[PDB]
Amino acid sequence: RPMWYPGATAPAHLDGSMLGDYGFDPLRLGVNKDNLKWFREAELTNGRWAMAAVVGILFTDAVGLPKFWTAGAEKYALDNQTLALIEVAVFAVLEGKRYEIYKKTGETGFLSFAPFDPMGMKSEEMKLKELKNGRLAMLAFLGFCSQAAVYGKGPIETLQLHLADPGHNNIYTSSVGPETAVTVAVLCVLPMIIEATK
Amino acid sequence: PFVPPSWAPSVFVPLTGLVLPAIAMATLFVYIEKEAP
Amino acid sequence: ATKLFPKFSQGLAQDPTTRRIWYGLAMAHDFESHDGMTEENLYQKIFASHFGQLSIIFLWTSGNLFHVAWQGNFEQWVTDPVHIRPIAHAIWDPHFGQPAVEAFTRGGASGPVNISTSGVYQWWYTIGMRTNQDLYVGSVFLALVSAIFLFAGWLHLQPNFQPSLSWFKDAESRLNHHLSGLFGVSSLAWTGHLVHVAIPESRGQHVGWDNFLSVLPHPQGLTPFFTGNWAAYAQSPDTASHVFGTAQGSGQAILTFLGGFHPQTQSLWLTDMAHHHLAIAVIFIVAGHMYRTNFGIGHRMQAILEAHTPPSGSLGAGHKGLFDTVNNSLHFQLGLALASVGTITSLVAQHMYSLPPYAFQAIDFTTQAALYTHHQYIAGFIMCGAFAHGAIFFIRDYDPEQNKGNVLARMLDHKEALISHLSWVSLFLGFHTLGLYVHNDVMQAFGTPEKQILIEPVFAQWIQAAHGKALYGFDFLLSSKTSAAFANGQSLWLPGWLDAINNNQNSLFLTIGPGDFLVHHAIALGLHTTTLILVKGALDARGSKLMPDKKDFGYSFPCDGPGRGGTCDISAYDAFYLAVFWMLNTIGWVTFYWHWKHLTLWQGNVAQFDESSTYLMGWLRDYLWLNSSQLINGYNPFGMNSLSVWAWTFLFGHLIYATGFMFLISWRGYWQELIETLVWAHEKTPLANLVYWKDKPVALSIVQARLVGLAHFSVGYIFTYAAFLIASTSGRF
Amino acid sequence: IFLFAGWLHLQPNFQPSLSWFKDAESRLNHHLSGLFGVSSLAWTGHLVHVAIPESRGQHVGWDNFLSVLPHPQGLTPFFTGNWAAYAQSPDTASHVFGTAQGSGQAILTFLGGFHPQTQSLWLTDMAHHHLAIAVIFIVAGHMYRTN
Amino acid sequence: RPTWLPGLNPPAHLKGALAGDNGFDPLGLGQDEGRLKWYAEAEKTNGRWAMMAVAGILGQELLGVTPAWWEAGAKEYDIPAQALTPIEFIVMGFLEIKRYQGFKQTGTSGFINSFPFDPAGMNSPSMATKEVKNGRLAMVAFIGFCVQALATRTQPIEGLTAHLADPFGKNITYYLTHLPETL
Amino acid sequence: LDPQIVISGSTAAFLAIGRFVFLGYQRREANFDSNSTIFATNDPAGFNIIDVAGWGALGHAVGFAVLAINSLQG
């Protein structure tokens, strides 16, 4: 059972019953058993949202459509006032039906279908793959927003620019260079800090 | 760059031809004749 | 007492003689014969060995790349690949005097260097390498990949990482992943490299890791692929005046099927190669979904095997039980793999010399000769290994009770008929080929060359005429202009293919005559005799009339003693041993034929080969004696040149061959008695008996003697022919 | 770093014992010699190396303090005992703060009073003050018996 | 067992079991065996880094590099210093955490997972004493290199040749007194 | 030639011959062909996601082959 660094120790409440366990809880926010399930469901839905959002942002830059941070300013074939009213009206019923699913079963669902799987490949390994991909997509979305904050342009453009000069084009040579360098050094020292005390 | 110096063959060829084979031969010869407890 | 080496055999470790070291070194890879070996541990050891071999291969490739980038002249060879000789690596030998230093100083270098014959320059230049920086990056990447493979080999042997026994026997999953992933995805990736890097680099556009994400390989940019208008990708190809490496006359197509060869480089088109890799990638990927693994759909190889028995009972039980006798036998799988690998290697040699795939490879005669000979000898050794492992399968893993009535048991049921018919074919071919050669020799000696028997190879010439060659005049299939087979390819690939096959300046279906017919019969004789020895040794491995219990003695053992008239070389190992000589002789004949025909073609006089290839005196004088004049003149009392190393290698191979003859003719007993006399001499000598041996000196065993003699024979054979081939081809051109 | 030190001194293998907190002689010796004397000596080094040359129009930063001499005689009067050489040629009454007009070469003076333009104490006087109190505090840091 | 001060008995906490134990501890930093063994490992690794640093400085000077050993940081290089710091910190963190965890399982040095990292044998207590002594000499030599470059602005071999050419001069007295002439 | 019409028609046609024509034959051959995952579906004839993916792959390959052949203008 690999941990979040070579030589970690579970904080007595992450024994491994949950999928994708690595003993990562320094703030100990999952000390409560009741909060662990809710936080897990929140992590799963945040991961699903980030997965769909990252795939959508990556697809818009390939075709040539407007950037993800400027797509809202574009004029569509509707009114923004009516869009917000419809969005909160549909999501009220959708989120209400999803919340009642978690109280009866404990996982996500769509509308009145708690185990929503028309094809049927709901396996234990598939649940962990969803969590891993969701975590990766959450970091990817944070990276998309951060790259657009300092460099702008776009994710695909950022990757293309990094290939031109990898030794000179990175987060360390950008406007947030020293902060991230100090943070990387502090993070690299952190496992030794935890292992020195234990 | 990865280019070795000009004196590199004059040191690596005698090494690979006399230092490494002598050490390897002596180590292997000692290992073969080791008596079991 | 008992020594630590070997650790896998306590019986060999208790041996107090020198036989312990030799046997421990020769049985280290025999995992099934170690102490305390199970099936799971066996498979794990083989897995680690596979990783170690992969690491060695990748490290060797990285070493070649590094030496070409460091001491080679790749940056200057690409500018003039016709008049500049490639450089392998530098030479640092303190034994060289002044003439050797200036003699080996060639190829525009600043010191003594070796001129390469491996052909890596043409291959790397064709795939996209232009500067030494590319070779350095490739060498570093391959070294890191080799290190990762070595670490993986060490990691898979530790607990929590060792695969289970059932994992190694998942034939359906492994075959689906190798057909779809290792074969299809790899070919698709190669197509991507050819379209994205090789094709733009050959047209004068440098595309690398720093600019491939912004350079479009086609002006339409992936649109015709998604819209199904793939025919737009073959539009505007490279014209007949295209210069390799520049933009002069370069087209914009990425996937074509023009066929033939490039007019300048005399090699295959890059667009055709990319299209080829794409088509085979699609085929391999589709073929990767044939077996059922974990999703219900698919097939089961056991069901297909058990459902293939003819109703007439001609094959007995058919293929029933073949899945269990193959999945549970590693020697069967290794034999099948080696047989296919050897056949593919021979296919590679033939296709590469006839259809040159790398740019400026046909002009390099030494590269062609060395590459063809190298691949053919490797293929011969691999084929002998396939048959040897088949014999090992019969002795160690064959189960007659499980294979009752199937095709495998029926092979041993009529093995006498197979060996007898192979003997008849080999005898007929040998008698007729030797008789025709001696008859032609006598006619040439008596001054009557018109009296010799010269049978025209009408069958192979007919096949060549079917392919499109109009020199013979059969005028049919691709040779006749009114045929449907001819008119159906005139718009896709037949123009270039016909223009390349009808040209007599290339190696694409060379003209053949009576000499080619006779040497082909000699080749057939060598193949049939080698097959006879190997097949007879594999079928008689479990027993015969002389030794009814040979299966109880293992694959390799000395003999059964002098009883029953004599049982020398009765094991299957001895059959393989006698077959190695026939393999070397067969490959020697095929390589002699290839070298002589191509030498006469490159010299511009094919009539010399056509007139002297019918009698053996022509082969001995006009080929072996005429082409060795420059080789043996590498060093003489008048001085030396760069060809002296090949002369030394020539004599080196001759010496090794003759040394092998000693282990092959003289046998153990005489040597053991001599060793006993030497033991007495050392034990009764003052100032020297104080230094006593730790291992009792004994003569080499019979099996060890056969292996040592065979190894010397093969090494001397290979080095002698390689030295003669490279020296003659390099000096002549 | 100080916050991390506070968190680290509470974890096991880093918590000081009660006997360590009661070593009054060692604590007083280190506070008088190191926390007071060495800190004052370092402040004197900054005033002599940076503040005094910057007040005379000469930029002295981390990029050039190893190649810029605080005094033209370069540590020779300090080792030879001719300390009065560091008080020679001070800033005149027409010196403009931040420029070289009217500036001197002295680094340790005791002129007293205030600067005619800035109406503040002389930088050389403050440097000399910190040097004297640094020597006094360091000497006072060897009064108690520790080991 | 000879000590550093003649007529001075070695302390009770310092016994000859360690490699370079010469009974030198006037401050008493190795009272407990836990801190003593941790400091022993710290001394060995400090000496290893100092040995590599002194060897590198001497090799750079002997091979005629353009900048001195105190200017190599500001020299232009591919992948600038701003980008080299995180890569070095990540790889050093991994290597050092593996070295530290291997030290907890067994009280010895190592390399990632080879504890002890001892290929081809050649290990003995005498070799350990030689390693500790060479490390101490290298540490003192590195500090000498730093102070020599500070007060004389000359590289190690250059300063040594300058001292050999004129012994009675070009020493600590001349360089400490003729400081303005050096700059 | 319209790519959307060809691809849609080819995929729908092979999915139709896989659901209404060759479903029983494929099920009978898969049964006699004899750690796994069972793909339960609400289709009355057991046409799970695996069969849909396989038939759709065959349909897309045939449709793209037809589009390519017609694109060659031969």
Curated annotation (Swiss-Prot), chain C:
Residues where [4Fe-4S] cluster binds: 559, 568
Any one biological process term the GO annotation gives: photosynthesis
GO MF terms, alphabetically ordered: 4 iron, 4 sulfur cluster binding; chlorophyll binding; electron transfer activity; magnesium ion binding; oxidoreductase activity
Domain of life: Eukaryota
Sequence intervals crossing the membrane: 46-69, 135-158, 175-199, 273-291, 330-353, 369-395, 417-439, 517-535, 575-596, 643-665, 707-727
Keywords associated with the record: 4Fe-4S, Chlorophyll, Chloroplast, Chromophore, Electron transport, Iron, Iron-sulfur, Magnesium, Membrane, Metal-binding, Oxidoreductase, Photosynthesis, Photosystem I, Plastid, Thylakoid, Transmembrane, Transmembrane helix, Transport
Annotated SUPFAM superfamilies: Photosystem I subunits PsaA/PsaB
Any single GO CC term annotated in Swiss-Prot or TrEMBL for this entry: chloroplast thylakoid membrane
Main location class: plastid
Binding note for cofactor: P700 is a chlorophyll a/chlorophyll a' dimer, A0 is one or more chlorophyll a, A1 is one or both phylloquinones and FX is a shared 4Fe-4S iron-sulfur center.
Location of this chain's protein in the cell: Plastid, Chloroplast thylakoid membrane
One Pfam family named in its UniProt record: PsaA_PsaB
Residues bound to phylloquinone: 671
Binding site for chlorophyll a B1: 654
Reaction catalyzed: reduced [plastocyanin] + hnu + oxidized [2Fe-2S]-[ferredoxin] = oxidized [plastocyanin] + reduced [2Fe-2S]-[ferredoxin]
Binding site residues for chlorophyll a B3: 662, 670
EC numbers, comma separated: 1.97.1.12
InterPro entries: PSI_PsaA/B, PSI_PsaA/B_CS, PSI_PsaA/B_sf, PSI_PsaB
Membrane topology value: Multi-pass membrane protein
Protein's job: PsaA and PsaB bind P700, the primary electron donor of photosystem I (PSI), as well as the electron acceptors A0, A1 and FX. PSI is a plastocyanin/cytochrome c6-ferredoxin oxidoreductase, converting photonic excitation into a charge separation, which transfers an electron from the donor P700 chlorophyll pair to the spectroscopically characterized acceptors A0, A1, FX, FA and FB in turn. Oxidized P700 is reduced on the lumenal side of the thylakoid membrane by plastocyanin or cytochrome c6. Both potential cofactor branches in PSI seem to be active; however, electron transfer seems to proceed preferentially down the path including the phylloquinone bound by PsaA.
Gene it is expressed from: psaB
Curated annotation (Swiss-Prot), chain D:
Residues annotated as transmembrane: 28-52, 126-144
Similarity-based family: Belongs to the PsaA/PsaB family.
Name of this chain's protein: Photosystem I P700 chlorophyll a apoprotein A2
Subunit structure: The PsaA/B heterodimer binds the P700 chlorophyll special pair and subsequent electron acceptors. PSI consists of a core antenna complex that captures photons, and an electron transfer chain that converts photonic excitation into a charge separation. The eukaryotic PSI reaction center is composed of at least 11 subunits.
Species: Chlamydomonas reinhardtii
Domain of life, source organism: Eukaryota
Signal peptide from the UniProt entry: none
Chain's gene name: psaB
Function: PsaA and PsaB bind P700, the primary electron donor of photosystem I (PSI), as well as the electron acceptors A0, A1 and FX. PSI is a plastocyanin/cytochrome c6-ferredoxin oxidoreductase, converting photonic excitation into a charge separation, which transfers an electron from the donor P700 chlorophyll pair to the spectroscopically characterized acceptors A0, A1, FX, FA and FB in turn. Oxidized P700 is reduced on the lumenal side of the thylakoid membrane by plastocyanin or cytochrome c6.
Cellular compartments annotated: Plastid, Chloroplast thylakoid membrane
From Swiss-Prot, chain F:
Keyword Transmembrane appears in the UniProt entry: yes
Membrane topology: Multi-pass membrane protein
Main location: plastid
Swiss-Prot/TrEMBL keywords: Chloroplast, Membrane, Photosynthesis, Photosystem I, Plastid, Thylakoid, Transit peptide, Transmembrane, Transmembrane helix
Regions that span the bilayer: 5-25, 49-69
Superkingdom of this protein's organism: Eukaryota
Subcellular localization(s) per the UniProt record: Plastid, Chloroplast thylakoid membrane
GO CC, one annotated term: photosystem I
UniProt GO BP: photosynthesis
Keyword Transit peptide in record: yes
Purpose of the protein: Not yet known.
Family according to the record: Belongs to the PsaG/PsaK family.
Protein name: Photosystem I reaction center subunit V, chloroplastic
